[PDB]
Amino acid sequence: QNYGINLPITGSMDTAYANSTQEETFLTSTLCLYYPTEAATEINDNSWKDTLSQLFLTKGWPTGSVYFKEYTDIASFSVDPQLYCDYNVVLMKYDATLQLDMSELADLILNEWLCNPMDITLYYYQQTDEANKWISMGSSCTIKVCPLNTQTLGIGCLTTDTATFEEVATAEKLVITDVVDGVNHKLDVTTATCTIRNCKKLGPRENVAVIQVGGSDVLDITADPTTAPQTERMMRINWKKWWQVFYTVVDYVNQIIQAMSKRSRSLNSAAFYYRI
Amino acid sequence: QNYGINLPITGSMDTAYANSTQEETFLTSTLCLYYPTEAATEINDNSWKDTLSQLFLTKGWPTGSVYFKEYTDIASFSVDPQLYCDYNVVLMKYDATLQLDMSELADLILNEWLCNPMDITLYYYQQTDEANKWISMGSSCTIKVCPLNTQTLGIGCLTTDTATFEEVATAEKLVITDVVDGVNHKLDVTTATCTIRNCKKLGPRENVAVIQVGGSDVLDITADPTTAPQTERMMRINWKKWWQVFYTVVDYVNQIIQAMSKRSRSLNSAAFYYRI
Amino acid sequence: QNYGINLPITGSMDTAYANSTQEETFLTSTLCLYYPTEAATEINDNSWKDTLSQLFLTKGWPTGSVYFKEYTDIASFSVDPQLYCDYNVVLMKYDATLQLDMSELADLILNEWLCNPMDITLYYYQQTDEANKWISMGSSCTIKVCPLNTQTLGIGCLTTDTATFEEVATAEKLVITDVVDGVNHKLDVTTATCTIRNCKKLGPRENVAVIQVGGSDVLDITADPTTAPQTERMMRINWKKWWQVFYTVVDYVNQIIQAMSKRSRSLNSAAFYYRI
Amino acid sequence: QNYGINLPITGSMDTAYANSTQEETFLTSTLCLYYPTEAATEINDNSWKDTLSQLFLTKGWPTGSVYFKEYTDIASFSVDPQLYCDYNVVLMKYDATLQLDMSELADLILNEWLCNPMDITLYYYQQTDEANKWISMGSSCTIKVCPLNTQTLGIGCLTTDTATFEEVATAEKLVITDVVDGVNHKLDVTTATCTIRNCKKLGPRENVAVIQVGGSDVLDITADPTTAPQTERMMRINWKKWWQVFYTVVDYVNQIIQAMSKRSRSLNSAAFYYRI
Amino acid sequence: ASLIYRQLLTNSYTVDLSDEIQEIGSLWKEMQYNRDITIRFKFASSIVKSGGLGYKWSEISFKPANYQYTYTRDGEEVTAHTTCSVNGMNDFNFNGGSLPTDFVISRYEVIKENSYVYVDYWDDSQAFRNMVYVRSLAANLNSVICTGGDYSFALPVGQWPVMTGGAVSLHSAGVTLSTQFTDFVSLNSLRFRFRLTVEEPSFSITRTRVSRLYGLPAANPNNGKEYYEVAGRFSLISLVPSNDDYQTPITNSVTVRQDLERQLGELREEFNALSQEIAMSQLIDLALLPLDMFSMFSGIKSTIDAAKSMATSVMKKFKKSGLANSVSTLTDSLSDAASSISRGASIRSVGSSASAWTDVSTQITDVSSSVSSISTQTSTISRRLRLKEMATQTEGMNFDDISAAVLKTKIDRSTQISPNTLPDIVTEASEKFIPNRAYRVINNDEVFEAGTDGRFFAYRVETFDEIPFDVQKFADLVTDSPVISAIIDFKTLKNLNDNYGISRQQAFNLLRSDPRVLREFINQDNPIIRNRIEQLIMQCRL
């Protein structure tokens, strides 16, 4: 009712716990499963979606409340993935050659990013604080950056010649660039092929969980070298058969959802803070 | 905030006014000017963006805050319009032949919307409330509607024969359909060419203002025939050249922003909040 | 029961029992829809009237309460319009070339007119007050006026020569003539194909609403230049398809009726004032 | 007014009489004279209307208040007769062969009627009260009625064979049919040539006086066989020439209108209120 | 008047019994049509012969047959169409042997007393286009005799067996509405049932050990007759939509709101408007009636189909609403609490001892308003004291009585009735009528009071002064002792006592919601009680 105003909440420590709300949330919420194409290839069944839906119903989710989205690979999924379900679970296959990319993908879907546009042709750009990054996404991103001194002159680069710039990305379908804060950089990006945005990390995204299928703990969703937090929304499982992975996901859907929370930003209370 | 949304906020009617926050708002916000391509063509200059940014800087906007986005025309812009920054100003050129279309675009971007997918191939659909509409957009929409009775038989239209359905749109890049509430409708839409969603009007959108370049007051941002409100965010100006229009926008940017409100920007630039 | 006298009515500003039943309107009153023939042409369905009756019946109007009337165009409809239903809605299409005509049409049906005969052959005519007009209707009304002086001789005209008469209407299906008050005029009218009546504007016609399907607000139901009122019974809607127009009319019929009131001249209360 | 219609009006039996209002009544009213064509033919003059206007002025009517409407004969005038002026005087020439028609015309124009459309092809029709009649007028109206029974079967007539129906009117310009009340009737009428309406007699008209030229007292404005009231508004005179009749009308306009009352002219000129 | 709700729940089992047969099965004006009809019909025969040399028939059975004719009715030449079919037939068989030579009849159908003959009948007359909304329908017909005729069998060898004899009398028993499926339209028709009675002619087959067999085989049931005729009269009463006394539709093919709406959307406003015209004392009189199923559902002017299923349709909708599930959850909680001394820990008591009536639960809790714990406890308890109302554990007249009285007086007045509107308007009314309702329990000249709104009050009967509310005593009193609905709840009682000094007996009766004192106070036009009952009625807003 009172939107856009932060009112303190003064609950008491003695009020009794309420009954479980898990069943009601399962009845009123929708779940999205994101998996790679090789999963559906290995499973090799035209009705596996229906079987998984029936099993989820055995776990309490109403029929039709679970959606199964497919993506080719991590690179294709990193092209502004749109996660719209109340609860999103991304079955991300591990690849030792695509560690950073994997992290980048996680860093984009496990967090909240307030993004404003970037016209590299018009203005120079600097990153104000540690929470500010430059997220670029599209068919192929090649970001070259020229730091500028107080004399708006390139440092180790010429403003006029982009060949002297410094390469931070190459043919990337998603890259999060972190440059030194408080320095104006001239940017040369393949704007025709991909778009760049100045994005502030507000905080975690609670409705998105990432299950790393195979590998080890390699995700680093923080630009800070000193911190590599493995949050409760980053699971890891060893696998041989994709049917096993999906049975594990459906069996422990309770635990997976417990690790997640309703998107704080997408709900009525967030009205005139950012949305809804 | 959210737990305290349903709490009172009490204020004395004698509290001193705070100093003007216009300067702080300009120093901490971003402005987007949406203009048609004919504006850039008629201006016929390659540095006009830089000149406008400098003139805005004269008006208090730091360099890098003002952004310029070009759209070909109302029809193309109406296909899932994106509102990128804190303050959005849309210069809509008036054509007497596209009045409704203009209205629809305004009704899309001057109001908050909560949309859901519509599987027109599988289920029949109803509009529950006067706030409920069907917003469809894409390359080309052609919506045919068949009202049904309690027995699922059509009325004035055979359910199987789409040729008997009632046409409400044809090759529309955007259309907001409003059928009689409480009646089930079978929908035939060109799903290949355009997507339809069941949307609910939540309220006004404060961060989007539309300036109608030439013409008269023709916008109708409410489907109710008895109401044709002209909110403070719907401006109208007369023009003979586009440079005069842009200078008028720059000079009176303070007034234009005054008609708009902060905190209405969302992470996503989309024109609606999508639930699936 | 006391019909010829205006007796004061006293009420309490704190009176309780503010009951209501809009359903009484639906079952007791009849609705009439007046639309142009081109609407039926575009719809091109032989049972669209039945479907619209069904949809209205969804809103509480029993079958047989809603009537649909066809008119070829604004000019043809303007020839002695006869609106007899309890509630009248006229879907008037906008034509930029026929502004005044539309205004005249609205001025004829949105107001209450007390008209007396005019014998231009026998008598000269004045307009006593601001509410006095000369309304002429027919297949082709051509009115020429010669103002006289206190000596009965014409001003800038000869009473014996109609060629000098100042033409004020030419081939009009309907025209409302306003001349200088307190001046006798000789009128030359095509009595064979046009009847002219000396009319007084008593007041609003509560039970007639006009929905303008098209362009901007242009109606001027007041002869006074200084005022161009836009009453609640003058609606305006943007359109591209006629099925959409009729669906908007049906879905918001409750608001359209709310903007109207029972014809104060058509109930037993008004008995022996002018009519029933 | 309407809110105080059902309120008492109290008057002392000693309030002083007001001065004569006939002069102001003439100065603020209009008079209509309805006469046959044979009247003008016998007069055989073009300026006779002007002379009658001047004579009326000598009797106290401003130039412009007296109007003369010409009708061919009683039968033709009976088709949707129109009463235009504040005071209406109808000079009906008596013909011994048209007594009923004369009565019918009188019954139509000396009384207020409230009428509804009659779709004789879709409904059976009852006459609920002695005040309920079926008034049909047109170029030629032929009414055939089949009284049904409680089982919706014709009595003395085959409900499907119109040839067995009962002839109550044949080639009538106007006819007021009165059938037994409480009986459902199946009607077949020459709908192409005439319109039939279900009418209720509300009361006298008080502003229409019928002067019967020649003959005897034959008018019967009440369908009740045991009443032939002769109201003050139905007068009778003897004649040999029409100029004498018109001079009598002019010289006794005071007495003629003393029997009539203002406040009864309807906004419409029609002889009946209509409710569709 | 609350009894009706209970009875619906109590009778809900029969609803299931209905569904079975159903899934085995597959203003207004009254106008009369008594018509003298002549049903002319006939049977058809399906004679499918088996392979071999033709000595064996695979089947000789009945087949529905259509007939058209014209006859005179009250001087009208009326064209009639009929369709005759049979049901419940006896599959006799003849088995001359296992050889291909021997006469074998695999299965031949004979209609006997256990069979039925159905005849759809239609004509182009008026009566048969007015029968869309039917009040009553009943047809009488003279019985007819259908005799079986000869039918020789096509054997190329030896004597030709002949199927002679066989006869049954058709006696009219029941007439209903039915449909005839044409190419492009669908016709409403009258379907007549006929019971069979075996008759003296016994059918036998020659060249066989078959004789003295009774029935009517399907071989030649027409016996060469062009048609079988029954003459009679059918009485129909049709409900034609009319909004005026002078018009009457020739045909009733009009659309009603329920032909287009399955979820009543605006009838809620109709009910809320109807609430204005409710009298107060007479409403109490109606609320004291033990409104049973018959009383509740007898006065509705229904159609032929609607009356046939009103009670069970209402009950089908009734045993799904929040009220029924609350009753079920209360019963399950009581049974579980009685069923195990194991989980007194899981349940937490706001009384001396554990009871399902006295348990605290989810209560997501409302930080919007500063709420005391006692308020939450009392509200949670009162929300089950509602089930006490609907468990015959109350003493005075309860809010459910008022809800039922309002429901009855509104459904009778409401012109919107249909086989789907009365369901979901009785149930949703019981769910949404008087949502905020208070209860009181008396003990040792002290009254405890709770409300679903969270307001609690303790006071003394002799003088209405509030007392420190003693939770854990109100709970023990309310779990066992009679619970009284607070029609005249504390605030109104104190106002009345202060302004209209009431006697000890009057206060005694008002506390226990005695109808007599309530109606006597209403008849005195006492503003306070009238105001309270007005609030209660306006709360019955659906």
Ligand SMILES: *[C@@H]1O[C@H](CO)[C@@H](O)[C@H](O)[C@H]1NC(C)=O
């Ligand atoms: C409440 O909690 C109990 C204890 O586990 C559980 O059995 C029950 O289903 C929960 N929900 C409700 C509505 O009682």
Ligand SMILES: *[C@@H]1O[C@H](CO)[C@@H](O)[C@H](O)[C@H]1NC(C)=O
């Ligand atoms: C506000 O403005 C006043 C006067 O312009 C100035 O003295 C003051 O420092 C400003 N800031 C605050 C917080 O009052």
Ligand SMILES: *[C@@H]1O[C@H](CO)[C@@H](O)[C@H](O)[C@H]1NC(C)=O
């Ligand atoms: C009325 O008539 C009387 C006598 O004829 C005259 O004196 C008077 O002025 C008139 N008017 C009024 C208002 O009395």
Ligand SMILES: *[C@@H]1O[C@H](CO)[C@@H](O)[C@H](O)[C@H]1NC(C)=O
């Ligand atoms: C208005 O409604 C109230 C309660 O809703 C009722 O008491 C009253 O009688 C109604 N009508 C009038 C005319 O007071």
Ligand SMILES: [Ca+2]
């Ligand atoms: Ca990357």
Ligand SMILES: [Ca+2]
């Ligand atoms: Ca370099």
Ligand SMILES: [Ca+2]
């Ligand atoms: Ca940085």
Ligand SMILES: [Ca+2]
């Ligand atoms: Ca890190």
Ligand SMILES: [Ca+2]
């Ligand atoms: Ca459009």
Ligand SMILES: [Ca+2]
């Ligand atoms: Ca159609």
Ligand SMILES: [Ca+2]
């Ligand atoms: Ca709608």
Ligand SMILES: [Ca+2]
């Ligand atoms: Ca509007």
Ligand SMILES: [Ca+2]
């Ligand atoms: Ca001139």
Ligand SMILES: [Ca+2]
């Ligand atoms: Ca004109």
Ligand SMILES: [Ca+2]
């Ligand atoms: Ca004038």
Ligand SMILES: [Ca+2]
């Ligand atoms: Ca004007």
